[PDB]
RNA sequence: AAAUGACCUUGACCUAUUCUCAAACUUUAAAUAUGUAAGAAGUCCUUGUUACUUAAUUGAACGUGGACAUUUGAAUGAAGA
RNA sequence: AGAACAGAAAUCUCCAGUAGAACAAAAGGGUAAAAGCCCCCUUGAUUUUGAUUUUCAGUGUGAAUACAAACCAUGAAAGUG
RNA sequence: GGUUGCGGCCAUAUCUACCAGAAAGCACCGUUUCCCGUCCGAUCAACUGUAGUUAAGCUGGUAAGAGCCUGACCGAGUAGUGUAGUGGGUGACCAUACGCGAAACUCAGGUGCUGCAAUCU
């Protein structure tokens, strides 16, 4: 850095470091405190979070609860699972976000026992609804959306995950005003448009409009849609069939591994440098003051 | 080693400091509008001076930041006025550069006495790809030393393309 | 108009500095703490003699200045003004009050009367460095200064080298090999700790393990 | 005139622990309290709500209530020649589970074990605690260690 | 001739040093004092009650039934409490 | 450290920055994706009657804390008020 | 072992300068029809995962490095302090007896450990 900047030892000495996960720019604790903590008179009742994160085009849904030793995953679903259910493209998109949520919804809701009862909306006309408690039966499983550092904006796809997880039978308390199709100057939801996003309508129409306007770009991006021969119209039935596949068998097959833990460890340990002994460190000093010191 | 790191212009920011608010300022504003294609932004005075004749919060000036191909055009268009010769100053240690011109007519822009004549501060901030690390919300980082823009590097960049001169010392 | 110094001899009060809670206090009568040749190099003045207090008491700023003059005056006219380096080791930071005077003992909080240096037993008051050849001269300087002070103080010959913290042989060992480097009136020492880079920029005469 | 307000005199008491300022770590809220639990009271200056009065700083007591953000704590405070019962509403940031009974709980569970293991062999227990006893006799060897003889040392200076 | 000229000059600033200080300064931090605990109102197991609470006969509080006695859980004292 | 008029002080940019600022007011605590600064939506500065802490006689008054029963505000929400 | 998402303790994780990073992942990165936000699609929103890159982020290693953490009959049984005397001293103060006992200093050692889920030559 610059000379007149530097840092005093005095500066470094009194410096209080933030939490590691804040220094990493990952966890927002002000939100986390208020997400996690439980009514003290509910004792060991956990507070489950529906955690949604977007990598550069991969989607992550985990239902997570807290322990002072560390957090605990009840269940997890990623958008890269979607090829199993018949979605090979655009795994980062709104409709993909919906699907994954539904996947996460059915998956845990299954392994809790609430599989059969509480199926949520099977119709998906995109109406605004919460899964209601069943008269004389178990209350539904309750989960709170953890948006992380994502900005809340109306039409954001973090609320896509929310929609499918809600549509999947989970109880995720929410309002309608961040869903695509929310009107600014009147508080009203257009369900026609929200239904359109669930099925990828905004992507299909863009495919349409590039079909005849500019075919230079349509070839660049959407390239893969050509290779498998999928044009716009059929996209609604890709995601419709996806939903049914998910609801039929949510159960989460893992990858086949191939090269066990030991095996990956051996190969990776090659590329990790190792520290030295104080002996080695000392030997370098003495060597240095034989050379740099002793007049060449 | 230079794969990726290039010197893009991050943004160009035009600035006109008018000694007061009212008709003169909104005219300076109209200049930046039709010149930048964007609606400019105006700045209030931070405190009161009275030998400069200004009151705190008075809307003293207007400016605009332009990015993309647009910025290169206005850069070039002003560099022509400066006759493609800058000085060894104008170049910050952090790698940006700027100049200024009286009489905005020297770049395109016909006269129109209902408007009048204004000067401009031109200021160019250079950077490379991967600057997002500093500006993004999540995992906000700082760019590594070798990646950082330096004065030496930007003078060099400025000498090569535009084929202009640095002069001085 | 100064009260007789008998009045302030003992430390009866918690320290009362000049401060934002005080502010009105008068200037110290002793404003210079370094006399003689103060620019001089550590090597030039090996011998060090101290004026050392045997009491726990208070010394007025007036008496420090008075004694400063006394010692410095004697030393120069006898041994020369560049012969020695005199250092007053004690700074009068404690403010003495006074209640000056219809009204009685009512509301008796005093106003600043003057300054005093608080002083321990074994606590050093003056320090002087010279050539060994000058020892008698310096000692007579401190001995005369004594008459300007309340309470008992004694003069002690140091085991150290001038104003350093090292004893005479221990200093030589460090110097006569590599590790001592001049600074204006003082010396810097070579550390085994730290960057090997600029450790050898400074002290280049080391790392020969020789003279 | 004099000033006796609620937080008076509390300057360093409610101060924050050097290089410990800021948000309170999340484990403080993950802890769980039950009626009857024994807690220690220490105020957290960053949390202005639900704060103990300074008198109860460093004081230990028992939980008589559990509520949303807080726990009620009863404390015997002595005023006059007697103790009166005090009931404190405190937020969980100012309360900590006490280890004051830990050794006892440990010592009980260990005592049950030794007692069963004793009965199952036979008798011979001795499970009460005993004070430090004086040392037994011993034989110290001069081999390899012959007494070094020390004298007091003369007066010196080194100033 | 000027210089965003060079060179002396004194100020402030920066760097690494140096002498000395604090009731209303301080990283560190005593001694003396000070809170609680050292069991039968204790520990453990089995599984009832409810309008609280849980995704949930989940938990929370209060219970029924069962297991272990004076080394039953430090010291000293006790013209008793 | 850089930019016409522009100067010690106007407006523009980048870098450094543990808070060295700001939070009506005295001071002291406290606070950094806030408790500070800019914006959006608001009236919980509301309704009912008890318990509690400081001062204490364990009276009153002031101020405050944690719940219960309402009606509301805000936020995607947990929450918060 | 690596990596990611959510974490616990919150510098042995911070800071300054260099160098190295397989595979995967993260990343940077392309685009502006759509929801959405801007003086500026830079941030923010969406779309593609295609067109490109390990340069930066990120991970690790180096340094008689700064800071930080730990230890020691290092200093020091020192400073301070509870109890005692018809002890010393004009006094200021100071020794002694039965106890408790620091901080600085100095030297040595160290430079994140770890929970849940997923993935990877
Ligand atoms: Mg230093
Ligand atoms: Mg902080
Ligand atoms: Mg938030
Ligand atoms: Mg490259
Ligand atoms: Mg003007
Ligand atoms: Mg006294
Ligand atoms: Mg009088
Ligand atoms: Mg007065
Ligand atoms: Mg005398
Ligand atoms: Mg007072
Ligand atoms: Mg309040
Ligand atoms: Mg002192
Ligand atoms: Mg103090
Ligand atoms: Mg006691
Ligand atoms: Mg007993
Ligand atoms: Mg008895
Ligand atoms: Mg009896
Ligand atoms: Mg204040
Ligand atoms: Mg925050
Ligand atoms: Mg009111
Ligand atoms: Mg009173
Ligand atoms: Mg009464
Ligand atoms: Mg009052
Ligand atoms: Mg790769
Ligand atoms: Mg975005
Ligand atoms: Mg690299
Ligand atoms: Mg990263
Ligand atoms: Mg070091
Ligand atoms: Mg002593
Ligand atoms: Mg004592
Ligand atoms: Mg006596
Ligand atoms: Mg003593």
Subunit partners of chain A (3 or more CB pairs within 8 A)? B, C, D
User: How far apart (Å, rounded) are the C-alpha atoms in residues A24 and C109?
Assistant: 58
Look up residue C164 and give its DSSP letter: S
Task: Return contacts of C34-37, CB within 8 angstroms, 24+ apart.
Answer: C34/C85, C34/C86, C34/C87, C34/C88, C35/C68, C35/C72, C35/C85, C35/C86, C36/C72, C36/C75, C36/C76, C36/C81, C36/C82, C36/C83, C36/C84, C36/C85, C36/C86, C36/C128, C37/C81, C37/C82, C37/C83, C37/C84, C37/C85
Interface of D with C (CB under 8 A): 157-159
Smallest CA–CA distance, residue D27 to chain A, in Å, is: 5
Measured between its terminal Cα atoms, the distance across chain C in Å is 62
Identify the residue whose tokens are 């140091």: C158
Neighbours of ion ligand 4 (CB under 5 A): B 3-4
The experimental resolution of this structure, in angstroms, equals: 3.0
For residue A10, give the nucleotide whose C1' atom is nearest its CA. Answer: G67
Pairing type for strands C180-182 and C187-189 reads antiparallel
Distance separating alpha carbons of residues B62 and B38, to the nearest angstrom: 12
Q: CB-based contact (8 Å) between D67 and chain A?
A: yes
Q: Which residue is nearest to nucleotide G37 (CA to C1')?
A: A153
Residue recorded with tokens 């004298």 = D151
Helices (H), C12-126: 61-79
Q: Which of B137, B138, B139, B141 to mutate to test the interface with A (most CBs of A within 10 A)?
A: B138
Q: Among positive and negative, which fits the CA dihedral D89, D91, D93, D97?
A: positive
Locate the chain C residue with the closest alpha carbon to D156.
Answer: C159
> Percentages helix, strand, coil for chain A, rounded to the nearest 5?
45, 10, 45
When computed from its CA atoms, the radius of gyration of chain B, rounded to whole angstroms, is 18
C160 CA to centre of ligand 9 in angstroms = 25
CB contact under 8 A, C196 and A289: yes
> Does the beta-carbon distance from C196 to A285 stay under 8 Å?
yes
Contact of chains A and D by CB distance (3 or more pairs under 8 angstroms):
yes
Contacts of B146 in chain A (CB under 8 A): none
Beta strands in chain C (DSSP E): 34-36, 47-53, 57-60, 85-88, 94-98, 111-119, 124-130, 153-157, 180-182, 187-189
Of C96, C99, C86, the closest CA to residue C38 belongs to C86
- Report CA-CA distances (Å) from C10 to A232, C4, C5, C18, C59: 99, 13, 10, 19, 9
| Cα–Cα distance measured from residue D10 to residue D55, given in angstroms and rounded to the nearest whole number | 10
DSSP C79: H
What is the C-alpha to C-alpha distance for residues B146 and B149, in angstroms, rounded to an integer? 8
Residue A225 tokens read as: 């849609």
List C-alpha distances in Å: D103 to D25, D38, D40.
Answer: 27, 14, 16
- β-pairing, C85-88 vs C94-98, is unpaired
CA distance B73 to C105: 87
Residue given tokens 């919060």 in the structure block: B57
| C119 in Cβ contact with C53 (< 8 Å) | yes
Q: Strand F positions with any atom < 7 Å from protein CB?
A: 1-19, 28-35, 51-55, 57-58, 62-63, 65-68, 75-81
Residue B43: count other Cβ atoms within 10 Å of its Cβ: 14
- Start-to-end CA distance of chain D, whole Å, equals 51
- Which parts of chain A are beta strand (E)? 49-55, 58-65, 72-78, 144-146
**CA at A43, C1' at E65: how many angstroms apart?**
28
| Cβ atoms of residues A78 and A60 within 8 Å | yes
Count Cβ atoms within 10 A of the Cβ of residue A7 and give its class: 0-12 exposed, 13-18 middle, 19 or more buried: exposed
- Residue A288, H or E segment: helix A278-291
The CA distance from C69 to C135, in Å, is 19
Pairwise CA distance, residues D60 & A234, whole Å: 70
Cβ pair C146, C153 in contact under 8 A: yes
Give the whole-angstrom CA distance, residue C58 versus residue C42.
32
Q: How many whole angstroms separate alpha carbon C87 and alpha carbon C60?
A: 17
Measured CA to CA, the distance from residue D35 to residue D27 in angstroms comes to 20
β-pairing, B120-127 vs B8-17, is antiparallel
D26-CA/F72-C1' distance, Å: 31
Q: What is the Cα–Cα distance from B37 to B33, expressed in whole angstroms?
A: 6
The neighbouring-strand residues paired with C85 are: C36, C129
What was the structure determination method? Answer: X-ray
| Helix or strand (DSSP H, E) at C200 | helix C196-201
Question: How many angstroms is it from D115 CA to the middle of ligand 16?
Answer: 28
- Whether A37 and A45 have beta carbons less than 8 Å apart is answered as no
Q: Quick check: C202 contacting A, CB < 8 Å?
A: no
Q: Do A292 and C208 touch (CB under 8 A)?
A: no
HSE, CB side, 13 Å, CA atoms: give it for residue D13: 16
* Cα–Cα distance measured from residue A242 to residue A152, given in angstroms and rounded to the nearest whole number: 27
Q: What are residue A233's phi and psi, to 5 degrees? A: -45, -40
Q: Is A256 on the interface with B (CB under 8 A)?
A: no
Q: Where in chain D does DSSP place strands (E)?
A: 38-41, 59-66, 70-79, 82-91, 95-97
The pair phi, psi for residue A236, each rounded to 5°, is -65, -30
Q: Which residue has the tokens 């809670």?
A: C21
**What is the distance between the terminal CA atoms of chain B, rounded to a whole angstrom?**
29
Comparing CB atoms, the residue among A14, A30, A40 nearest residue D66 is: A40
Beta-carbon neighbour count of residue B97 at 10 Å? 21
CA separation, residue A186 to residues A14, A154, A180, A190, B29 (Å): 54, 14, 14, 11, 35
D2 touches strand F (CB under 7 A): no
Q: Which two tokens stand for residue B27?
A: 């005219």
Strand order of the β-sheet with C34-36 is C34-36, C85-88, C124-130, C47-53, C153-157
Backbone torsions φ then ψ of A71, nearest 5 degrees = -70, 165
Nucleotides of E under 7 A from a protein CB: 4-5, 14-24, 26-28, 34-39, 42-43, 53-62, 68-69, 71-75
Q: Which of B109, B108, B24 is nearest to B62 (CA)?
A: B24
Q: Which residue is listed with tokens 């309470």?
A: C151
Residue B106: which region, alpha, beta or left (left: phi > 0; alpha: psi -120 to 50)? alpha
Ligand 1 is an ion; residues with CB less than 5 A from it: A 9
Phi and psi angles of residue C51, each rounded to the nearest 5 degrees, phi first? -95, 115
Residue C45 to residue C83: CA distance in whole angstroms: 9
What is the Cβ-side half-sphere exposure of residue A249, based on CA atoms within 13 angstroms?
7
Are C196 and A292 a contacting pair at CB < 8 A? yes
Question: CB within 8 A of D37, min separation 6: which ones?
Answer: D62, D63, D97
B88, B44 Cβ separation under 8 angstroms: no
Please give the Cα distance from C136 to C145 (Å, whole number): 14
SS3 sequence, chain B? Answer: CCCCCCCEEEEEEEEEECCCCCHHHHHHHHHHHHHHCCCCEEECCCCCCCCCCCCCCCCCEEEEEECCHHHHHHHHHHHHHCCCECCCCCECCCCCEEEEECCHHHCCCCCCCCCCCCCEEEEEEEECCCCHHHHCCCCCCCCCHHHCCCHHHHHHHHHHHHHCECCCC
The candidate with the shortest Cα–Cα distance to C16, out of C133, C115, C100, C98, is: C115
The nearest CA of chain C is from the CA of A288 a distance in Å of: 9
Please give, rounded to a whole number of angstroms, the shortest distance from the CA of D157 to a CA of chain C.
Answer: 8
Q: Which ligand is nearest to the CA of C120?
A: 12
């Amino acid at each position: 850095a610059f000379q007149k900047d530097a840092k005093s030892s005095a500066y470094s000495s009194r410096f209080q470091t933030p939490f590691r996960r804040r220094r990493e720019g990952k966890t927002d604790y002000y939100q986390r405190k208020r997400l996690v903590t439980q009514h003290k008179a509910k004792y060991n009742t956990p507070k489950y979070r529906l955690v949604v994160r977007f990598t550069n085009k991969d989607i992550i849904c985990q239902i997570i609860s807290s322990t002072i030793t560390g957090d605990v995953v009840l269940a997890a679903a990623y958008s890269h699972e979607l090829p199993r259910y018949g979605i090979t493209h655009g795994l980062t998109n709104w409709a993909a976000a919906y699907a994954t949520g539904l996947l996460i919804a059915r998956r845990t809701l299954q392994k809790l026992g609430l599989d059969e009862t509480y199926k949520g909306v099977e119709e998906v006309e995109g109406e605004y609804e919460l899964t209601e408690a069943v008269e004389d039966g178990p209350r539904p499983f309750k989960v709170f959306l953890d948006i992380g550092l994502q900005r809340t904006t109306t039409g954001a796809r973090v609320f896509g995950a929310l929609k499918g997880a809600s549509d999947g039978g989970l109880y995720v308390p929410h309002s309608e005003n961040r869903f695509p199709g929310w009107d600014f100057e009147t508080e009203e939801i257009d369900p026609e448009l929200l239904r359109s996003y669930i099925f990828g309508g905004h992507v299909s129409q863009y495919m349409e409009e590039l079909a005849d306007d500019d075919e230079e770009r349509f070839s660049e991006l959407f390239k893969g849609y050509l290779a498998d021969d999928i044009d716009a119209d059929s996209l609604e039935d890709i995601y419709t069939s996806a939903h049914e596949a998910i609801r039929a068998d949510p159960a989460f097959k893992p990858t086949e591994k191939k090269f066990t833990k030991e095996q990956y460890a051996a190969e990776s340990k090659k590329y990790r440098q190792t520290k030295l002994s104080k002996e080695e460190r000392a030997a370098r000093v003495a060597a240095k003051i034989a050379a740099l010191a002793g007049q060449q | 080693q230079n794969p990726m790191r290039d010197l893009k212009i991050e943004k160009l920011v035009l600035n006109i400091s008018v000694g007061e608010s009212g008709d003169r300022l909104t005219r300076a504003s109209k200049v930046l509008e039709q010149l930048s294609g964007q609606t400019p932004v105006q700045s209030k005075a931070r405190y009161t001076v009275r030998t400069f004749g200004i009151r705190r919060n008075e809307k003293i000036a207007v400016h605009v930041t332009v990015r993309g191909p647009k910025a290169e055009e206005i850069l070039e268009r002003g560099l022509k006025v400066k006759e493609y010769q800058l000085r060894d100053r104008n170049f910050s240690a952090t790698g940006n550069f700027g100049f200024g011109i009286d009489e905005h007519i020297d770049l395109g822009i016909k006269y129109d006495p209902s408007i009048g004549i204004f000067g401009m501060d031109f200021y160019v901030v250079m950077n490379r790809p991967g600057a997002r690390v500093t500006r993004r919300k999540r995992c906000k980082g700082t760019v590594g030393n070798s990646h950082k823009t330096t004065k030496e590097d930007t003078v060099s960049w400025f000498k090569q393309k535009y084929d202009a001169d640095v002069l001085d010392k | 108009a100064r009260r007789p110094a008998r009045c302030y001899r003992y430390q009866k009060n918690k320290p009362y500095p000049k401060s934002r809670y005080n502010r009105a206090v008068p200037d110290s009568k002793i404003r210079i703490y370094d006399l003689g040749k103060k620019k001089a190099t550590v090597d030039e003045f090996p011998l060090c003699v101290h004026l050392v207090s045997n009491e726990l008491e208070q010394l007025s700023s007036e008496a420090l200045e008075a004694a400063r003059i006394c010692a410095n005056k004697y030393m120069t006219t006898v041994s020369g003004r560049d012969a020695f380096h005199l250092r007053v080791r004690v700074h009068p930071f404690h403010v003495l009050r006074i209640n000056k005077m219809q009204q009685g003992m009512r509301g008796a909080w005093g106003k600043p009367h003057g300054l005093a240096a608080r002083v321990d037993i074994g606590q050093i008051i003056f320090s002087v460095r010279t050539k060994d050849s000058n020892k008698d001269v310096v000692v007579e300087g401190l001995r005369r200064a004594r008459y300007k002070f309340p309470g008992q103080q004694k003069i002690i010959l140091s085991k150290k080298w001038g104003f350093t913290n090292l004893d005479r042989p221990e200093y030589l060992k460090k110097r006569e090999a590599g590790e001592v480097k001049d600074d204006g009136a003082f010396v810097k020492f070579l550390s085994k700790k730290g960057s090997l880079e600029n450790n050898i920029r400074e002290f280049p005469e080391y790392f020969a393990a020789q003279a | 005139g004099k000033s006796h307000g609620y937080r008076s005199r509390t300057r360093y008491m409610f101060q924050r622990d050097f290089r410990k300022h800021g948000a309170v770590h999340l484990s403080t809220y993950l802890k769980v309290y039950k009626v009857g639990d024994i807690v220690d009271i220490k105020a957290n200056g960053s949390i202005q709500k639900g704060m103990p009065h300074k008198f109860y700083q460093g004081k230990t007591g028992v939980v008589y209530n559990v509520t949303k953000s807080s726990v009620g704590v009863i404390i015997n405070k002595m005023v006059g020649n007697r103790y009166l019962e005090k009931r404190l509403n405190l937020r969980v940031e100012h309360i900590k589970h006490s280890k004051c009974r830990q050794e006892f709980l440990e010592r009980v569970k260990a005592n049950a074990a030794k007692r069963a293991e004793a009965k199952a062999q036979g008798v011979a227990v001795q499970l009460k605690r005993q004070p430090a006893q004086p040392r037994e006799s011993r034989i110290v060897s001069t081999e390899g260690n012959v007494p070094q003889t020390l004298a007091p040392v003369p007066y010196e200076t080194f100033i």
